């Protein structure tokens, strides 16, 4: 999670704002807003407004704005402080390009308050999306079936806003374990918030920090397009050595790429759900020496066909080759892939719950 080298010489594509709701949501939002970079004249690129009831845990500059709902978060308390909530949005997010309403599902923040925030930003013409966590415990999602749940209205109105970035806590916890086998569970949240913040910051950075090798780009404007696409969005990342990108024995590297597309950075996507994507963008980044030998029609055409067959309904999916002119000798043979796939369907676990609600 250290992008100091890339930052000093690069930039971010979108000035993100984060509207956190509830503990988990506010925790993620705060972490993103606390983000410190070496980007020149943009030390703290992200801003956040944290909406939560009063609490000591709430223990979480000037880039952050806290809004207490008292109650010492439900639809009622949200609506009862909506004027102050919106005034803070009006005063803190004027220079933002995109707002992420950050909320935990199955947690202590109802979908009722979530829908009200979505209605707010929509009625006021903001560019915004959803950054939502799914609980490690399935049993926690049953809350979505409760009498006051508005998960169905949110799902049915996906076209009103941008991408829904889902975060699978079960997934991040395992990465946390396999990563830090000696750490205590009590340390997970910290790691998690940081992983989420880094994932979003990384793609935001990569899309405005390197030199395009061709006329095909995955730049700030294309990133904006994808991020503003309705439906679920999945981020994927892969690093390989030059010697594996052998277009004559494509299975090694393509197997790795296909696996990365399904086992994303924050959520896992089924082959059949990916096939359902509406938008797709992918960037490759490597050294000047490697770029010269790697970026030819054989490789790029092979890449285009592979991706086309996996996301058949994507109108135009750019394969954008880039060169990191600042690549060290040690990183010289490394080839990095950054993928964004948008307009994905909601995952089965959530989708089954919505269908149950429609029946009822």
């Amino acid at each position: 999670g250290n992008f100091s080298e890339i930052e000093s010489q690069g930039n971010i594509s979108l000035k993100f704002g984060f509207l956190g709701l509830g503990m988990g949501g506010c925790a993620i939002a705060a972490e993103c807003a606390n983000k410190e970079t070496q980007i020149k004249n943009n030390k703290y690129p992200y801003r956040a407004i944290l909406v939560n009831t009063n609490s000591q845990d709430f223990k979480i500059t000037g880039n952050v704005r806290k809004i207490q709902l008292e109650g010492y978060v439900g639809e009622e308390a949200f609506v009862k402080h909506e004027t102050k909530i919106f005034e803070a949005v009006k005063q803190e997010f004027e220079d933002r390009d995109f707002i992420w309403i950050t909320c935990g599902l199955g947690g202590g923040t109802g979908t009722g308050a979530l829908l009200k925030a979505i209605e707010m930003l929509y009625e006021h013409d903001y560019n915004f999306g959803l950054l939502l966590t799914l609980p490690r415990d399935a049993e926690a999602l049953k809350v979505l079936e409760n009498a006051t749940s508005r998960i169905r209205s949110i799902a049915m109105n996906q076209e009103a806003f941008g991408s829904i970035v889902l975060i699978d806590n079960a997934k991040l916890y395992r990465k946390f374990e396999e990563e830090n086998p000696s750490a205590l569970a009590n340390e997970y949240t910290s790691y998690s918030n940081k992983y989420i913040a880094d994932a979003l910051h990384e793609i935001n950075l990569v899309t405005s920090s390197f030199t395009p090798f061709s006329d095909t780009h995955f730049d700030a404007s294309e990133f904006a397009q994808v991020i503003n696409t309705p439906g679920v969005l999945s981020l994927a990342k892969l690093e390989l050595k030059s010697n594996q990108l052998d277009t004559e024995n494509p299975l090694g590297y393509l197997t790795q790429l296909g696996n990365a597309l399904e086992k994303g950075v924050l959520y896992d996507t089924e082959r059949e759900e990916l096939e359902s994507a509406k938008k797709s963008a992918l960037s490759i980044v490597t050294s000047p020496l490697r770029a010269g030998r790697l970026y030819n029609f054989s490789f790029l055409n092979q890449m285009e066909n592979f991706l086309k067959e996996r996301t058949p309904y994507v109108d135009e999916r750019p394969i954008a080759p880039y060169v990191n002119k600042h690549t060290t000798k040690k990183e010289e043979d490394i080839v990095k892939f950054y993928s964004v796939v948008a307009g994905l369907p909601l995952p089965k676990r959530v989708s089954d719950i919505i269908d149950e609600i429609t029946r009822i």
Side-chain angles (χ1 to χ4, degrees), residues 182-251:
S182 298
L184 293 184
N186 154 65
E187 303 171 57
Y188 172 61
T189 295
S190 165
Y191 167 95
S192 179
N193 302 332
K194 181 196 84 301
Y195 185 84
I196 293 162
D198 282 342
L200 296 179
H201 182 60
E202 181 163 40
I203 187 61
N204 196 204
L205 194 55
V206 163
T207 54
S208 284
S209 299
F210 301 125
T211 315
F213 190 76
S214 69
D215 299 324
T216 299
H217 302 171
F218 182 1
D219 54 4
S221 171
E222 167 68 14
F223 185 49
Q225 267 267 94
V226 172
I227 291 282
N228 278 92
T229 297
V232 174
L233 182 156
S234 185
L235 300 174
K237 186 204 314 179
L238 174 69
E239 296 200 341
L240 298 186
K241 297 268 209 165
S242 304
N243 54 305
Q244 310 181 67
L245 301 181
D246 173 3
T247 65
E248 290 174 283
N249 225 299
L251 290 186

Side-chain angles (χ1 to χ4, degrees), residues 121-336:
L121 301 194
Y122 185 67
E123 291 175 348
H124 287 99
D125 195 39
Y126 281 84
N127 287 108
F128 74 99
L130 267 38
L131 179 49
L132 321 163
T133 63
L134 287 165
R136 300 170 55 196
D137 176 12
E139 190 82 288
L141 282 189
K142 65 190 162 184
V143 78
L144 288 175
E145 299 186 347
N146 86 51
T148 66
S149 172
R150 300 307 302 285
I151 190 61
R152 180 164 182 283
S153 296
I154 300 175
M156 273 176 78
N157 295 118
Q158 289 172 246
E159 296 295 311
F161 48 89
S163 71
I164 299 181
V165 171
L166 295 175
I167 296 149
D168 179 353
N169 275 122
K171 177 183 175 81
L172 299 198
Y173 193 69
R174 292 193 182 187
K175 305 205 183 313
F176 162 66
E177 281 170 341
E178 301 164 356
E179 226 61 295
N180 307 281
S182 298
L184 293 184
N186 154 65
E187 303 171 57
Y188 172 61
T189 295
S190 165
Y191 167 95
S192 179
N193 302 332
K194 181 196 84 301
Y195 185 84
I196 293 162
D198 282 342
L200 296 179
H201 182 60
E202 181 163 40
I203 187 61
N204 196 204
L205 194 55
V206 163
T207 54
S208 284
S209 299
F210 301 125
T211 315
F213 190 76
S214 69
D215 299 324
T216 299
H217 302 171
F218 182 1
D219 54 4
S221 171
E222 167 68 14
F223 185 49
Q225 267 267 94
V226 172
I227 291 282
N228 278 92
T229 297
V232 174
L233 182 156
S234 185
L235 300 174
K237 186 204 314 179
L238 174 69
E239 296 200 341
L240 298 186
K241 297 268 209 165
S242 304
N243 54 305
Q244 310 181 67
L245 301 181
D246 173 3
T247 65
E248 290 174 283
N249 225 299
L251 290 186
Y253 90 90
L254 289 182
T255 291
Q256 298 272 70
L257 180 60
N259 171 268
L261 287 180
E262 296 181 22
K263 166 191 182 62
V265 179
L266 302 172
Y267 203 69
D268 297 327
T269 308
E270 294 284 295
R271 151 185 180 288
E272 294 80 16
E273 299 181 311
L274 276 171
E275 150 185 344
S276 200
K278 301 304 190 310
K279 281 277 214 302
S280 176
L282 182 149
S283 292
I284 306 176
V285 184
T286 193
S287 68
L289 176 43
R290 257 53 219 171
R293 312 173 308 82
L294 173 69
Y295 302 147
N296 45 66
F297 177 88
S298 301
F299 173 62
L300 297 167
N301 184 67
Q302 183 166 263
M303 283 286 280
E304 188 181 359
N305 291 329
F306 185 71
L307 252 53
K308 281 186 177 179
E309 291 297 76
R310 280 173 170 65
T311 57
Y313 301 71
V314 168
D315 187 16
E316 292 174 282
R317 58 187 82 57
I319 299 296
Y322 285 77
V323 174
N324 170 0
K325 295 188 173 307
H326 294 286
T327 311
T328 68
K329 182 67 188 307
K330 178 177 288 179
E331 329 162 318
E332 186 165 60
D333 297 307
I334 308 297
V335 179
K336 300 192 193 80

Side-chain angles (χ1 to χ4, degrees), residues 43-63:
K43 191 164 189 174
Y44 295 106
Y46 308 126
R47 301 178 70 68
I49 287 168
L50 319 169
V51 189
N52 210 347
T53 45
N54 286 32
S55 70
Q56 62 198 65
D57 279 339
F58 183 36
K59 239 170 189 299
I60 284 193
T61 53
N63 277 46

Side-chain angles (χ1 to χ4, degrees), residues 34 114 145 212:
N34 281 166
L114 176 60
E145 299 186 347

